[model samples]
Target: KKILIVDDEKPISDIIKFNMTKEGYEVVTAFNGREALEQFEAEQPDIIILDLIDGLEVAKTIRKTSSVPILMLSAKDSEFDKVIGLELGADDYVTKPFSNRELQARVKALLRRS
Candidate 1:
């Protein structure tokens, strides 16, 4: 499976890439929305783990073009934010400070359904 992880924070992106790679998924990363689009076009990833820096815009754009699964991540843990993300086409929404195990499980579940 191929995954695209988009985050402005290097530490967060690196950790996710490392763990997912260990789990044997091909992981690619982008540091911002522009690069995310670039990688998205190039890699054609199966899943997108998008962090909250211009993330909503990216999700909107992706939804307009593809039905690929999207999992949104953010520090904001409110019902409003989650609803908006889901309404914008995110398949899953994860708050920051998430467990690696939980993330891996969610990713796996999304992959399975797809």
Candidate 2:
């Protein structure tokens, strides 16, 4: 399966990519929302993971036209991030400081449902 991970921060995208690829997923990375959309159109990933900042917008944009599973991420402590993500129609949402194990599990479950 293909997974697209978008994050404005460096290393985080790389980190996610590394872990996902290890799990035998074809991983794609985008540093910004525009690039994320471009990759989305070309790659047609089964799962998309985005970190809030521009990531929220990417999720909102994609949800308008696609049913692909999206997992939202944020580093903030505020519940607004989670709330807004769900309001924007993301399939699942998570915050930062998460274990790659849990992230993988979430992705696994979402992909299964998709």
Candidate 3:
């Protein structure tokens, strides 16, 4: 399986890649919305975990073009309020500082559904 990870937070993206790669999936990373789409078009990953910050627009674009499973990362205690209204039909929303186990579990569930 292939997974695309898009986030402006390089550390967050790195850690997600680190953990997910260990699970046998090929991981691809992008640091910005533009790059995210570039990679999306280039890789056509099975799943995409994109940050809800700069990634919202990118997520919207992706949804319009593909039915790829999307796991959106949202900031808690602040924009979390806007997430429900702004999530734009993503497969799931994961609050930042999210647990590794929980993140992986959600990914597994979405993967199964797809």
Candidate 4:
């Protein structure tokens, strides 16, 4: 499976990529929302792991025409983020400080349902 991870934080994206690659999935990284969308279209990854409010416009822009199993990773745990993301049609979301195990599980579950 191919996965696209979009986050401005290099460490976050790198860590996710390392773990996913170890799990036998191809991983791609984008540092910003615009670049992420370009990669998303060019690569057409099976899954997308996005940082919902990471100073990037991806989630809002991508949602315009996609139902492609988006799993949002956000530090924002407020109900506002939850409602907005769900309303915008994201498949799932996990807050910051989350374990890789949980994130992986969420991704798998989202993919299974999508």
**lDDT of candidate 2 over 4-104, digit per residue (tens):** 98888887888899999999999988888899999999999998998873776788789888988999888875777677888887888888888999999
TM-score, prediction 4: 0.91
How many backbone clashes does every candidate have? 0, 0, 0, 0
Alpha-carbon local distance difference test for all models: 0.95, 0.87, 0.84, 0.82
Q: Point out the worst 10-residue segment of candidate 3 by lDDT.
A: 77-86
What alpha-carbon RMSD in Å does predicted model 2 have with respect to the real structure? 1.2
lDDT of 1 by residue, 15-105 (tens): 9999999999999999999999889999999999998739999999988889999999999999999999999999999999999999999
Which pairs clash (backbone N, Cα, C closer than 3 Å) in model 1? none
lDDT of 3 by residue, 1-114 (tens): 999998888788889999999888899998888999999999999999988626667888888899899888867536554565246767877787889989999999999999
What order do candidates take by lDDT, descending?
1, 2, 3, 4
Task: Provide the lDDT at 77 for model 2.
Answer: 53
Candidate scoring better on lDDT of 2 and 3:
2
- Model 2 lDDT-worst window of ten: 51-60
lDDT tens digits, residues 13-85, model 4? 8889988898899988888878888988999888998886343257667778776778888899999987777
Ranked by lDDT, the better of candidates 1 and 4 is: 1
* TM-score on alpha carbons, each prediction: 0.97, 0.94, 0.89, 0.91
Q: By TM-score, highest first, what's the ranking?
A: 1, 2, 4, 3
Using lDDT as the measure, the top candidate is 1
